[model samples]
Target chain A: SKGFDYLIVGAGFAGSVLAERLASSGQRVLIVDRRPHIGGNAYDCYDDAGVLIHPYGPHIFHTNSKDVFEYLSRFTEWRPYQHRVLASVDGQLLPIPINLDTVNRLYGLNLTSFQVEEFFASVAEKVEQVRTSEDVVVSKVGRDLYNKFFRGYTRKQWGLDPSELDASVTARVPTRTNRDNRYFADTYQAMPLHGYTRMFQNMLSSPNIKVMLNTDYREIADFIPFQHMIYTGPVDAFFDFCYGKLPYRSLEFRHETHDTEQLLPTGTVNYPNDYAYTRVSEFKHITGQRHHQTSVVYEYPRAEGDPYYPVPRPENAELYKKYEALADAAQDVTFVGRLATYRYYNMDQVVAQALATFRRLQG
Target chain B: QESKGFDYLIVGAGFAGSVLAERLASSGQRVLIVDRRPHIGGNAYDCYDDAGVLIHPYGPHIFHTNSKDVFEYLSRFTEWRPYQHRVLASVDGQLLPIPINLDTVNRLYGLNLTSFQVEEFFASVAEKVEQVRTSEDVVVSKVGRDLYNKFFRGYTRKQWGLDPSELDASVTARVPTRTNRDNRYFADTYQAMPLHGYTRMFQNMLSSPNIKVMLNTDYREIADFIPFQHMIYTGPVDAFFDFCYGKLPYRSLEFRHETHDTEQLLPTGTVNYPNDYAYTRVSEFKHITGQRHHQTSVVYEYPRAEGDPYYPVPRPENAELYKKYEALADAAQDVTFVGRLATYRYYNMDQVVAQALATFRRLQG
Candidate 1:
């Protein structure tokens, strides 16, 4: 490749956003990815029967940042898509996150939003010095709700039980007595009108920027000459894991097409206590697509797959600091992303992080 | 008085007049829009309370429509906040989903039933009516008189100032009895609210230099003063002809708004008091307006004998009177009757926008 002003790694939100911003600011940018796609994990495309499925998993776009939303709004039109998830507990598919409807439906008790608070208090077991995920649920709701909803899913997703995981893990899932079944309560909730892939294509469409797919950055590290570089790959891998391997929870996604148009009542249904797969997301619900044949993806949490989630634990936090020291001392290369920095963040958070990095570099 | 030579004289700058005013002005026509009320949004107006919490001065106007064109037309003036309306009927000392879904029936009776079994249960209790005529028959024929009395009977009587037996089927039939567990109040393609209040949206709509707005002014006082090409009337049709046919019946409403110290005042957006209280429902403004504050405000809906004309009385006799006004409205060559008040038909916000846009296209032709 010809010498460019800036060479960017991983054509995801972190890389593509930086590529677009840098190129627009009169810098010649070259972005590369090994995935043969531009949108990274947020990429989506039509499958065999023409159902718009998220190949990597469901990436529901939500954020409270008007800055991030308006910045991304430049590349693609938006369709207001609020996500709602139902958990298949016992026989009925009740609202996940354990709201008033979930409690009333599961217990066959008619309780108002105000009364459900008393109901939770009646069932809750007092716990001293809450630390683990198990204590977080049991202290608020109870062990029965924890077993039925949180225990299995958290165990399956992280390959660890609620007792072993941090309280931050289970505390993310809010318990609302009010019947707001929305999966997210963000101010801005929407999806790209076409798909994430098309938005990425538009972001990188500047003539000043060039992109290469299915090519690892390490293989072309010596060959592609550039003055500056933005590395969005794993930081541990960037330094060849000299300290230790940062544990990242991975998942196996299996996409299945069904004859029925509509499968679940909502976008995603969590099998917290039931199946091998933790959740099954119907694409039509998330994408608002209309088609005769519907397609759904099963998220099978595994130890060996693509690095999806950075396991949040005290031990994992200490290991990342060593890589952070290396990152601070590094020359001519900037590490930023979910894998690059080793932090689990939403897609919008990654975009904001990338833009902030670019802002720092300019200053 | 100088005739301003306005191409369109839009009366009552509500949803109907403002929408038509915007469209006609955009299409190269001079417009003069006036309203008796000082505000532009009519019943859908909203403002912030003294505590700085957004509140609907008039009762909450939750917008939900199946028409994409109508949604898009309003989208020009203001962006939307995604809002889905959920209503609970407080009956028998418990609040359950109104429109009588699977959960409502099961929770009300304390019976464990699935979506499939709930239909069978409803069939067992439902009365077999030979003729479906009154509002009572619509409910009793679908879910039996027990539910009709518990959920619909008292509320209908209080809201309309008439018993369900006296009201037409058109009154109660707007709400359907659902066997499914899904309990949204309306199953519309698009459900949202103006991101900024409805008053802001109307202000944006009437912001064009081509539009000249006169608030706190009646059309009757200004009509002879302006050389308007045509009049777009959105006021009561009975008043347009000076009630020559007689005043059309309308269900009036008065709102009692209060600022509660509590963050949340109700379970859902609204809870219908079908059996108790003079007020039919109390709608929390925070839920509909998407406002975040320590102090929450809600307005209790009181059905009144006389107030601002809100709901058009849907009955056989009123329909007959509206038909007489409709004849006179159609005979006018230069006047276009458009909106709930002018047409004497119950139309949602989106339907009014659609009707106004449709009227604009017809005028162009």
Candidate 2:
């Protein structure tokens, strides 16, 4: 049986950071993951055909924090990639985030940025209390744009109507007067030069850090003795469902490689009005890999599967609060990442959270 | 009383056969065009699938020509819809334009190279190949080894099933290099598609009273039955001569067409995957046809050693073998060799039409 100063349950951004930090501070760290790979959902590797592909889904790296950007930069060089998402609505590939171009293209109205802002104001349904996801979008971009872009997409992605979910879901997408078509306007937005997997490989390459893949935390928990445990797995699963399962959304990804150079104009095209899948992501757009054959993944959000996203709802949040208390009581264990914290967060947010957790532990 | 006697027996109803059939029949010559395949337009055939999305059943046929004569001649059959063809080579995970232009240079190397700087950059990297003979030499002399290997090496190897060094210089030279950021694959004077689809255009062209089209019928099967004055052979010349001088090499393609519920699948008309997989390229027809349909149909082209002959293998030994067949073709007074397979030269749709038209003129004289 192997022994370490720290046992990280998952080799994702959260657990990886903790392992790297602990190991660099002159402590032996053992990082174990059930899935035989690193970077969690951010993992990307070349398929059998040698086409660079994302097995999980397209993970576009973008952050507003300089510290987060510079910290990750240590592992891999950055490819200055600005993500531009298009929603396949109204028989056209219009820009998402309900931007000026999107409004102009949808209605065939040549409106300036200022006029587009005025247009949204005219059509918006004034909501006194912005409680639901539906209210957040309609109060900003009006009901038509919301119905066209957000409503159906949200329904497919979360398997719940925008009205029934928390406002946080709809607030993720912003409505802007500017003609900027970029999906995220983060200060530092780019893809890892090589890929997320290579970045993780570089991060976990410290002499004190040891990786044990295909080994679950529970499977070897008794055998490997460690003073501290970092768990990035679902918080609900850790507590053995004592308060029942905290609601989380899972996704089934259907990946396909075609012998064509380009498929779709953008990296990701949201199918708000059509398709069983919410969105289709072409890896060439994300990874910036130029190959003769392009690989694309169709993300089908299902009620069952490994939990990928924490379901954003009022009841779900309440259930998560109960689990948070249980997590707090377990002093030896540190629950981090989107799943462990019971919050839907982007990649950078998870990294920030993991860094903060490591700093607190050191103090 | 059924007329067994015809003025001409055209084998294979591809661009060359169809063009000749349309011309000779319209000029009051009773022409009979027989294709081994079940459809009319040959390799340029476009059809609607079960999803009601228009697709190129074989592979994408993008029409781009500088010749006004060829463009206007085809215009008589179908209306034109402008469509610029763009190709991206997948090199080291970057989608750079195939021709290695300004933007490709700027993005791939992370340098803000102006058009002038791009020319200088290409010249600096390009090796001085004194006498460019092979396709490999053509690319290496212009863009150097790195760009050639990244862009053309894998693609040419997969497409032709031979190293670019073994193939003719014209093979690689066919693709032009650009200094400006014109991502459109070809910088020809006109780039467009047949408005109502290629099959519809072929139908319109073969609609003349004197012309009759027979599908699923080979020329050899009915050679003795039909009393034709002359033969326009568009099938392989080596096969026509029963491989007496050995076989002239030809590359075949396996096409896989898929339909998605989404309107658009790819960003552009075609994507050239230089590296990875057995297949060479994938093309989404909606970009060219501009048909307003909820579903989009895409074709994946897999180059194979065997199937319907599409490209003539332009090698030195293959050329010598083709020359033997050419001599046989010359002696056969009533037979005419045309199109890609027969002529043993890779040609665009317009080039085939022009060749067919020229053959028609010689016959008329």
Candidate 3:
């Protein structure tokens, strides 16, 4: 019934950040979704059991970019969660990212950094061309180490052989003779004490922002005349598959509950063997909620429904390029988010991208 | 007036209650299904916005399971359409295939190798076969910590809300590293979409004349006068007993769905932002249902408290508590606890349907 300044989709890091920025600049904005609530992916609440769980899944805030971290600090207080990971291989616990300490512990060697280097050199297979995921690690550590850690686990995870892939797929790993077992070497790592939804609520608290839930824009798009639209749904769906449908990945989570005040191993656990699913996570491990009972969710990745991921194959990439051309022509609209943009990104990058988009509009 | 004189009182309107309602109603038993939420279909409910396109109200629900009986039972309610799932992670300014595939290997390292050459290459990098037991051994033994850290470490930490090392190996181990070029996400035998979508299937399952749907009503408020032979409670298990088992640990989700006249910038139907956002994933329902209406709806699901319960925490100590509550459930006469929250386990749509059918069969016996 009325024309507005801009129509923003999604109330997540991307949309919320943009909405706060744009609305702060005094632009009339209407944000709507088909669901009955707001706050997007950052929404968090306590369970009936008094355990705090990340609904869609667990989300840890880590970024090297100080600007992004500083920007987000405005909306919420930081709880300071430094994430760590351990691999349960052959019933042994070891720090992930294969730091120097991990190597020493696994091999039962008290060698110094130089000794560790000499050890790898002694066993090095002398691979001149490390091409696939298999080659990348074996070239330096040889076959024994690779088979134990990489082979079956890799096969179960992606349903493919490591040799057929490129070296980078598995080559991203770094082996050290010295001990450094921390999972990530990032500069900034933290979580919101009040939870993510609270941050989103703060971002959209402006008077210029109007949120309508359980109302689809398709039914009312024509009625609300907006100068431009910022869409964060799916890119292929936007063009209605003018090119072929782009491929994507999906997930199915199996949730379980326990009566104890805490969880097993005090954290997340990966099942390398004897399970159809990929992993299991205890909510108490992450939320730090002092509940007598705990919760956990198991994830099984699959190929079905809307592609959560665009198969990053050459054909899919090429097809998406063609789709991008059609999308480029849609001057009245701007595509956003993982589905609309056809790219994979962690949470910070999405917010960064959304903020950049807002700045462009602001200018 | 207290009007609770029904032959059966269904505590949930989800797959379990819907199916039970239909079965009993068709057998000439009058049934009334109640949900705390104002709508039906439970967590799998779908509705059209002002536009006529279909979208999941709670979040994107892709109907899939490995059990044949589960699949077969749901097939009775809705037909199937072939569907495959895939995902990408944004790392180092490029979209990479998840589960660490061949293409991902090549691009991440800037190398070009044929499938044949790839094996020799993997043979070169692979560790000697040991009893690789832990999650750490599973990952580092193959790709080493560099790749595992880049792709999985942060993700595992953020997703499970724990340090990956503290977690069981099964979590990160779910997305395995592949040597071959196969890009499919799931290895299940039967994977397909419900022909008319989940809500339609749910509606079809509960459409019997004997079943009366009363939405926008909470069963607890109307518990006094229900004249039923038995009660099938699908709500939180602890709520049934008023927390006598001390509230079996349950997880809840707060969904934020936003609508737009046009599609926003999204790379996929769901994008997992593990490192930057406090939330794990975001989904656009239009992409999920393939609804081609004029506008689009996107939902962001955040784990929270004081909302619709969805998942149960997976911790051994916590499980003992659930067992206690379950024992209580066994002791309670004329009642059956079913579905995710009541059973205290995360269940796929098909599993829910199958369990409902099996429970009904057992009840009849």
Candidate 4:
């Protein structure tokens, strides 16, 4: 018998969304994942204390895309959550992005939004042409601020200094004169009311799509008969590392539940210079979960671990282009997702990408 | 001609009646919109004075709302100017940010506090409120009595002609004590105003062919003769019933408008003359209008016992009086009452539109 019209690899956002859309349009779909769960990196589950924890890491959802938001809104209701971050430096925690309040608090000087622009202008070392992450920060702010906020974190996360990384890496980090401390300044910032797993479950609930768990796509690719395939796995892994492996920086998370209601003033705290861990996130502050006890994860950057952020360097970007050409040449296989595309994308962007892929596939 | 012309009679041509009228007219249902004022916009009405400067005659109306539905609904009629209102209060001879943010505390007390340290300072000063019932208690519980007096006490008394302790807790519920340094008058997701003016936006809202406008005419004058399937009343609930349960106590405002030779009178948009002046606050209209002018228009709000109804006073006795009128409104058939005045609450401009939008949705099957 003809098994399915489409066999989707990795039951993540890219695969799951494509599977749902294709199945809804009367196509039979088979989705397989190596992990026991469906949501891939975006998955969340309740701990022993019934507190929801993102298993992979904290995935914040914020977008300016109305189509992306409305599309995901169909699956689950959302809890309004604007992620706020603080950077712990010199024994004091200040808001990240080096906002007006951050400078005022750090320097013990009272400055208004207008005066802070003058203050930053005075401190800024104007770069003729900004090339790297270090130049990006120093051009807008100064060398001192770049070192205090960006230098250590960039070094730890990317396993390279800010001066070595590309300018595009830290371009979005705004040095705002105002005191807007929100991590993301998107129009819509919210988290699913239920966990991401439940939303994924609802997405894959259609009878036309079948889910196979704890199974890799390569294991079933030969046996499973399908009209087309959607690949969400690593592009380099698909070709058996034929052209040299693309470097991806990874992380190891250490999760702990504390006795208090909250451990941090905000959702997350970045330790730029103090600790081995890049940042610490308290889940209750993020999920808006009400409980007597709060759970937090200490995220340590590692050289060797599960693939997370694509190492954003010019050399690495050049290597990704080779994989991109090979991926486009591959037939009946849609390469859609962060890992497949070899680009670091936010949760909302990935969803939008998957939706666009489905729309193009329909045409 | 009047009998066959309209299907619904909508009183008032403000956000409340305008939105509902537009929605009803879009569905091929004709609405005869009547306003007692010579011009529309109700309390949110704006016009150019003799000096050719855009002025809010009723006082400065700042539009802000967290509701995307309400924001997007109004976005259709006019383009929005991204205007975030900032206010400074004159206290102890210093202009300080209100909504009692971190800078407000640190600047007032001569203390340097981080966002976290500010909370500790607030905790040190804030009174332990077990059962928060009064307007004073709601403020004192979060920001303590010192701030309650400096920022709120004088202003509340001047505006409402009553102490915050005598007022209901809901009066102070809207404002927040922020640990962070956000100094805007409102922390709404959508903080903006119509690019042209409120009057032009109202004009566009009431622009539908099926919507007929009747200015300077009380709905009661036409209600007797006009053939209407349903009546949508956006007036004061008590006024609609002709003060049957005694007029609901409304705190009115007398706006003293002035034209200054030079532009940019105030440091920010509005300044609260809390402890000193007869007027509660004064706002420069140019900051709101975003217009370059040789002369500026400013409006000072003087609270009065007898004048045009601006605020429905939040008091226990007033709420009791409003409840009686609300009960009567519930009993009326084929007649829907909506908006801040009709419902007897001090709602912002966006809240009135939201109430109108929600009421319109309920009318659908």
Off by over 4 Å in 2: B1-365
What are the models' TM-scores? 0.50, 0.51, 0.49, 0.50
Model 3 chain B poorest 10 in a row by lDDT: B159-168
Please list the C-alpha lDDT of all candidates, in the order they appear.
0.85, 0.84, 0.69, 0.84
lDDT of 4: 0.84
Which of the predicted structures, 3 or 4, would earn the higher lDDT when compared with the native? Answer: 4
Q: Give the TM-score of candidate 2.
A: 0.51
**Candidate 4: stretches off by over 4 Å:** B1-365
Model 1 misplaced stretches (Cα beyond 4 Å): A1-363, B1-4
Worst 10 residues of 4 chain B by lDDT: B1-10
Chain A TM-score, prediction 2: 0.98
Residues B64-102 of candidate 1: C-alpha lDDT, one tens digit per residue = 899988888788888888999999999989989988999
Can you write out model 2's per-residue Cα lDDT over B38-117, one digit (the tens) per residue? 46788998765545466788888899899999999999998888888888877788777877788987888889988998
After aligning candidate 3 to the native by TM-score, how far in Å is the CA of B158 from where it should be? 51
Interface RMSD of each: 29.0, 33.1, 19.0, 31.2
DockQ of each: 0.01, 0.01, 0.01, 0.01
Worst 10 residues of 2 chain B by lDDT: B46-55
